[PDB]
Amino acid sequence: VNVPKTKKTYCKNKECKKHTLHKVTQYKKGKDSLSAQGKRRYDRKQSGYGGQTKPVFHKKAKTTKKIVLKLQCQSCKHYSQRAIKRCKHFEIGGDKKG
Amino acid sequence: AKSKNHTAHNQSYKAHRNGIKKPKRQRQASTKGMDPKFLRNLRYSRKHNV
Amino acid sequence: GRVIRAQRKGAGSVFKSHTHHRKGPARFRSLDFGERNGYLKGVVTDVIHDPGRGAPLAKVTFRHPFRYKHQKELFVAAEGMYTGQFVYCGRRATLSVGNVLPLRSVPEGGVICNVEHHVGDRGVFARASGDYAIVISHNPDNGTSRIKLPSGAKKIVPSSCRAMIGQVAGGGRTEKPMLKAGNAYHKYRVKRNSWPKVRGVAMNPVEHPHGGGNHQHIGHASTVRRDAPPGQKVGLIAARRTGRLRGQAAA
RNA sequence: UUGAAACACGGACCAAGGAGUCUGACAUGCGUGCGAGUCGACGGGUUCUGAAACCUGGGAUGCGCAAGGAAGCUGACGAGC
RNA sequence: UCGUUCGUCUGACUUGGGUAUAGGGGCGAAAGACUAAUCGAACCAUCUAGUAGCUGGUUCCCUCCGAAGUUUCCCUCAGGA
RNA sequence: AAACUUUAAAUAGGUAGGAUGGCGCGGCUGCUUCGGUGAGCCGUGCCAUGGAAUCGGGUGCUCCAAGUGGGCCAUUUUUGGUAAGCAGAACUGGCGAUGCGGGAUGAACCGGAAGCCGGGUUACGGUGCCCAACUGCGCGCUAACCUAGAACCCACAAAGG
RNA sequence: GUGAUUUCUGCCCAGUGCUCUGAAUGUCAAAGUGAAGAAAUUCAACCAAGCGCGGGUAAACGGCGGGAGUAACUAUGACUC
RNA sequence: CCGACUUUGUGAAAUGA
RNA sequence: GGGCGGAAGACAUUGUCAGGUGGGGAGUUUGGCUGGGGCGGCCAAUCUGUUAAAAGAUAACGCAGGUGUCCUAAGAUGAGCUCAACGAGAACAGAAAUCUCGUGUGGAACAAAAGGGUAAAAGCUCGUUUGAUUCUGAUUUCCAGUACGAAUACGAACCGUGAAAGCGUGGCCUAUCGAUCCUUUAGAUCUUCGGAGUUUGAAGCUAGAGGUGUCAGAAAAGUUACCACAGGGAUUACUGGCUUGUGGCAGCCAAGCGUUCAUAGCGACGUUGCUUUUUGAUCCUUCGAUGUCGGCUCUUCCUAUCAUUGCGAAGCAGAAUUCACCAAGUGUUGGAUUGUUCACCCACCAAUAGGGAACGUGAGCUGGGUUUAGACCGUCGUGAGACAGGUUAGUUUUACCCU
RNA sequence: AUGUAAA
RNA sequence: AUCAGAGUGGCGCAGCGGAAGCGUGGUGGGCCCAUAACCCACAGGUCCCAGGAUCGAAACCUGGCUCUGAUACCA
């Protein structure tokens, strides 16, 4: 699945409010912070004896991930994100169909 | 022993013993969901009666 | 599972040494002025059989160096001692069989027995029936010496350590087949309750790692790690190899 | 139990004991008192058979009379067919 | 347990008293055997009226009304919403 | 020709058969139109013999809640199976929860549903005895030297002579 | 572990396990060090055993193949691929 | 099993700073 | 000489953290459906056609199949053209390369399964594009009329295309996907950190993703023949019941065999039945126990007759043998081997027929087999262990009640 | 690697 | 009875749609007196049978055939 490097789409930022010109990136999860409440709770709960307290997931069954496109328009430099359907082979601005 | 059972037996008998309840016909049938372009105008028109 | 036969031995309940008719410890004399700077004459009175041990034991009657009484010491018999023999104990005692000398007085190649390890620990090496240690070399800049032990292991020992000249008597005792459960039983009665021994493969899993199964077989590698927890360190502990030894493997 | 007189299970007979109770919260329904109030329930004073009864506080204790928001906050300008 | 018939009987022999090892422990010439008629985890008391979607029982009369084994979801199919 | 169809039943299915209708008049619209042009509403005034048949008070509105959530039999349609007192479905009724009269006996087949009594008449089923009712009045068929034959389900018999 | 005696114990270290060796420039914690920051903190380098990589071990656990054609009667197949 | 801190003090050299 | 004598020596070691190993040990799990369970499979999410009985709904481990994707175009729009195939034709050129004309209701194509639908299009080519966008509601489908997914119709924006009407909120429609908590991102120059501020961090609100396929979403391997408790005849194996595929039996027609001759005796292709000793199917009674194979003993009954009495027929000369009839009164044996029923031999015999009686018969026996616990071999499993594989040892209780 | 039985 | 696996040169076998090979075997020369052996050349196949999709098949899916390997247990 191919996505153009740049797409004309709506921008809800109060100062665009119109179809402007958006760059395309691909969403990658930011690395997990160690100061989140869920982590200073999971660490505390996990300390001491008792072993594993929160369940750990094993039965992975999917084989695709819903790609998220972080479209940045260059009229206010504000991102907005849109999810595309589940896909395996994904590429932004790939060589077009001949 | 076959855990799966499914019948329509007796179902009409249970249905018809408290009747097939028709909801009451109402004067001023409800306008919920009608075309809001029409409903805005109707509300304004009722607003400006004499 | 339950505690294994090999773990059960650490309590002593039925596994302590049968030590009722033993004749006391077999060891040298207390190291002192006379035995350090000269020689002491002891007369061997009788060579007794010590129950539970393969070697004869020679009772030796010294005269106490500084107070008026005898001293019945009890040595491990070196092959050759007979009642009435004078055994000499000290540094400047001549080198003859039965005498006890420091290793500073024993030339290279000498065959000795009942060796000390820390000077004065009263003799610990080469005591079993028919075992000796060969004194290999002397370093006089350290005051130390080297010896070849019965195991073939080669050890550095302090040079002021005593050692009985000769080899332990009763040699070749283990050369005779016992031919009988009887002889085995009477051997181990006066040593300790470690006989008969039941093959773990003929046990149930609850008491031995090898047990169980419709057939009699170990089931997994019979060699266990050095660090295996007790009750699992059973079999061939930390084996470096297995199989019948051939060639240099038996050197 | 779809199906018991069943070759389904319990019961030889008699007598006595024997199994939806108590407590907390909530809710509907009903009765009583008061009714934008209502509760005196923890205390206090009394109390001549009394662990009762009667009095007392409350000007804000509980609930109710205001709600929407996560929160900062804001908080019903008066109904016609 | 009894009867007859059997095995061994100088030996790894038969046995009394004293004594040691106590419960996930002991002891086992290994049968999961024995550990006080109890052992693939003794016995005694307590937590304890353990829990149970399962079996059994569930106490007076008359009058009146009076069904379901079907939908949906659930590690759900003997169950519950 | 179930996974073919031009055509195309029966049975069943949906809607309508007025008083919650219609017309006239003058008012609003931020909708709608080239536009009083529509669409809708609002105030007011008029008309509307009840607008097929039959029957009848209603869940009409609400609350709280019990039990149930193992089903089975039958006629018809019907899937798998060789068939099944077999398994799974459709419409209906019965049994379960139900006595009562008949089918000799049977949970669901036939009649029929019930307070307790007297009187009469019946349904299904019968009238030789058991057993209340006729060896009733008629007409034929059958002769079984196989236990002739004799009740919807039903307790069976065939092909063939 | 096997089980007197006699006779003999064949092949396989790929797999699992056991063990041995550590040049170091794989991975690899707490501590300890440096840098950024106003500080919490982050980032970096360094980083033990362990694992990895490399050898030994079968009287360690264990394992130990197929398909075709061929002899001058026929059959088989010494032999060959 | 091994690593660090601790009991844990003294002075000496060689390589890094 | 104020050192008891040596050894090692600030290393071992003690304590606290740190990482690895750790069935030696603890705790715990080891889904569901299911014509018993196990193995298999998915009929657990889900789509098309049929079953489905002409509205809707409608099941089975029913049937034929599909889905966990693919796509910046195979989405949106506009314009032009017509497709598969056939017919006649044109150097090399043939059955098939490229071109031209004629016919062409779709016999092509539309990403895929199957159904439906589409022809100046929903197909092919070309131009331009991103409506595959934003805000929250409403409805349909499943539905309890909850959610999710998907779809539909308006509204308020912003745009694409066309000249314009319009069309466009992804794929022509029907399937192609996801809760709470946690993490992470996007947004407001948003809200809080509760003594007041600057200031990192954190906590929020709205909208997405990280995924639960057991798909309304626990984090999870076996074995037990040493086993246990609750229960189940909702559910298996013995008997019984219905059924009779299958096992056994017997009719009808007559192509032929029977040296000639269909029917002495058979009777193929077909076809109709009977039986409940086999096996199968079911799961109706029985799991608060109906004592489970065989043999010994002993009794009774059936006929689908082996001999025995009487008969009829013959390819019946006699002898013997075959077919059938009335016929169940009488009889149907001793042994080798196997636990065996069954089998198969030796011999006698007139004959060595078949069967039923809760596969007659264990408070009648036996205990050989099978079917606990011991044990051995083999194959399997890493292991505990398994074997509808082989072998050995293995308690057989009660009557005095009623009949 | 080897060499008619056909004298 | 179900479930896998494999059907390719004469034999045993490699193969991932553009598409066929490996050893050996066979055919013709060469060396030798002659046969091997050795050197140099030559030709291969119904990619098990029958369909479909696919630019493009022997491979991809399916139906039919033949062999082999497993699982067929508690009673």
Ligand SMILES: C[C@@H]1C[C@@H]([C@H](O)CC2CC(=O)NC(=O)C2)C(=O)[C@@H](C)C1
């Ligand atoms: C990896 C993460 C796992 C999972 C989540 O962390 C598990 C949670 C959710 C839940 O059910 N309650 C818990 O405590 C565990 C989740 O949300 C996925 C999207 C992705």
Ligand SMILES: [Mg+2]
């Ligand atoms: Mg959060």
Ligand SMILES: [Mg+2]
């Ligand atoms: Mg803490």
Ligand SMILES: [Mg+2]
């Ligand atoms: Mg910790």
Ligand SMILES: [Mg+2]
């Ligand atoms: Mg059910």
Ligand SMILES: [Mg+2]
């Ligand atoms: Mg012993």
Ligand SMILES: [Mg+2]
């Ligand atoms: Mg031994």
Ligand SMILES: [Mg+2]
């Ligand atoms: Mg032994």
Ligand SMILES: [Mg+2]
């Ligand atoms: Mg054993």
Ligand SMILES: [Mg+2]
């Ligand atoms: Mg163990």
Ligand SMILES: [Mg+2]
């Ligand atoms: Mg074992």
Ligand SMILES: [Mg+2]
């Ligand atoms: Mg029942």
Ligand SMILES: [Mg+2]
């Ligand atoms: Mg009965």
Ligand SMILES: [Mg+2]
């Ligand atoms: Mg019971």
Ligand SMILES: [Mg+2]
């Ligand atoms: Mg009883």
Ligand SMILES: [Mg+2]
């Ligand atoms: Mg108040």
